[PDB]
Design a protein around this ligand. Structure first.
Ligand SMILES: Cc1ncc(COP(=O)(O)O)c(CN)c1O
Ligand SMILES: Cc1ncc(COP(=O)(O)O)c(CN)c1O
Lengths: 328, 319
């Protein structure tokens, strides 16, 4: 009942059935704690991920406005851009992507393989910049240029993380509550926290459907001081759009991303190896390997509220494995 | 069918989807069976087979899965993922079928994943007699203390092929269809669908586009397997096997221009990722079947996407 104003928003159907929520018995045996995984890495468009859920809402909005072109921004290996570009190709929309190299690599697989390879299969128009210093302004300037050609552009913010885009994670939280019903009593949920739509939308859903579950965001690009106001602002804007209040505190751990967005680290790589080798699950060096390194150290240090089951939200990212290989 | 032990790797039936943009472009209704979206380690058709073969492996108390393929085999990758998930060791007998020294083919895409899954790698100069060579390796590995179970190439035995009989049931539930198109390689996909569709959808024409062999070399292989699957299901199987072999030159594992064009077509019109070895070749055959009015009629076509996209990253920029 409490999430019913979610109905009001038009949304396209990109996902179909709920993604699997799976027990991880071998990882659980190794870590000493019950671990489940929400498989949003298996959403069925072009190698999947979390952004498909936000795109259901943002793209329906674009179509309702008569937009014929999606414009967005991200790193060269952005999964968000790749999902946007894929959904543009499927709907016959034009797509322009503003990309940066956030790590200064000159490695050939980073520059041309992985997600960046897929952009060319989707016929994305690619524009480089030096840095996404002000992505909102930079996307605007691009949109004016593109409007000047007669296109009708719809700007998707970095990660698709607006209140509307985040409604896809509010819906995720409904799936998750239904799938856990009479199957597992979760104590904790772990998700990577980047542009913040996933964390914020899960925060609102979970507050209203599973108030006693502890949600933990593991930052992938910023400290708690810099990330938390972003997540809170979205959380409140999402609640507002749904006529709800959201009084939960947002929780963030920032110890697992150094030395910076897009830079692999040892604990990240060891988490990827652990999940591949124990569960046949593929994480990624930028986002999910770092969030899973967080979950693991949190168990080790007793950082969670209790000893109860933890659900990891697998937000996707695997095609970056092939871009990061052999090194950047 | 419900008689054979099987593990649950897939779950809900995979989507069967209309492709409206590609249908618009080609002037014909095209649908696709998304077996590329199976949920383990980037997906594919082989998981369906592994549900039966691995259930059998555990029944024998095996602790090791052994299989063979090219360095970029999807089948080996999916086998190795299922091993990891189940806590079985995995041994992969690999060959370089194309003589390349390109770094991405040698170490990226499916091969990178084998390393993530702690797969034990054995190189061989050629899979001249895969069944015999797997047999020999199984005996060495046993001699080191393991209990191996051998999975044949493509996991394409009668048992393994039952997973494709299952796919046909899903296809029948999900479906005014005239044709179905599928890559035809190690032949379990083709033969299992052949048996399933003969019974469930007898008016539909099943076309296998070969990826490694001529019609002459492939047809007996598919027929034998068709008959062996039908025997074990206590079914009859009298349908002809239809193969087009024009779409794979110059050989298995070698991309060709029509295949790369089909990959680009599906990506740009529908956001769908094919692959250079299997499904881009099979799609190229589908497209040229339209070009050459080569199907029985002008009616709907279902393409079976059997997977393979991770090889995109191995084959780039070239081999
Ligand atoms: C795999 C993956 N996981 C998580 C994230 C971070 O999600 P969010 O931007 O909603 O914080 C992203 C960002 N595109 C992602 O690609
Ligand atoms: C993506 C892909 N397509 C189709 C095939 C061919 O299927 P089969 O080997 O059962 O003929 C394979 C074989 N491993 C494959 O990996």
């Amino acid at each position: 009942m409490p999430l019913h104003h979610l109905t009001r928003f038009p949304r396209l159907e990109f996902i179909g059935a709920p993604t699997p929520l799976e027990y991880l018995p071998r990882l659980s045996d190794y870590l000493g704690r019950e671990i489940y995984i929400k498989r949003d890495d298996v959403t069925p468009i072009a190698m999947g991920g979390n952004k498909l859920r936000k795109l259901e809402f943002l793209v329906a909005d674009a179509l309702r406005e008569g937009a014929d072109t999606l414009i967005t921004a991200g790193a060269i290996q952005s999964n968000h851009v790749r999902q946007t570009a894929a959904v543009a190709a499927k709907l016959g929309l034009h797509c322009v992507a503003l990309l940066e190299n956030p790590i200064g690599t000159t490695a050939e697989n980073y520059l041309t393989n992985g997600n960046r390879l897929l952009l060319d299969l989707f016929n994305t128009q690619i524009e480089m910049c030096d840095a996404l210093t002000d992505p909102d302004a930079q996307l605007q300037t691009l949109a004016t240029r593109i409007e000047a050609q007669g296109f009708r552009p719809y700007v998707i913010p970095v990660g698709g993380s607006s209140a509307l885009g985040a409604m896809g994670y509010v819906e995720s939280a409904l799936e998750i509550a239904q799938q856990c019903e009479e199957v597992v009593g979760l104590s904790s949920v772990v998700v990577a926290s980047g542009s913040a739509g996933t964390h914020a939308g899960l925060a609102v859903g979970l507050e209203h459907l599973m108030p006693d579950v502890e949600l933990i965001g593991v930052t992938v690009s910023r400290s708690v001081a810099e990330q938390k106001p972003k997540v809170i602002a979205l959380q409140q804007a999402i609640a507002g759009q749904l006529a709800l209040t959201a009084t939960a505190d947002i929780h963030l751990w920032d110890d697992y991303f150094a030395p910076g967005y897009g830079v692999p680290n040892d604990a990240g790589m060891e988490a990827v190896k652990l999940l591949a080798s124990l569960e046949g699950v593929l994480l990624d060096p930028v986002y999910t390997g770092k969030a899973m390194a967080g979950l693991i150290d949190g168990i080790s240090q007793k950082r969670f509220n209790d000893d109860g089951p933890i659900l990891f939200i697998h937000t996707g990212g695997a095609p970056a494995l092939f871009a990061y290989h052999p090194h950047v």
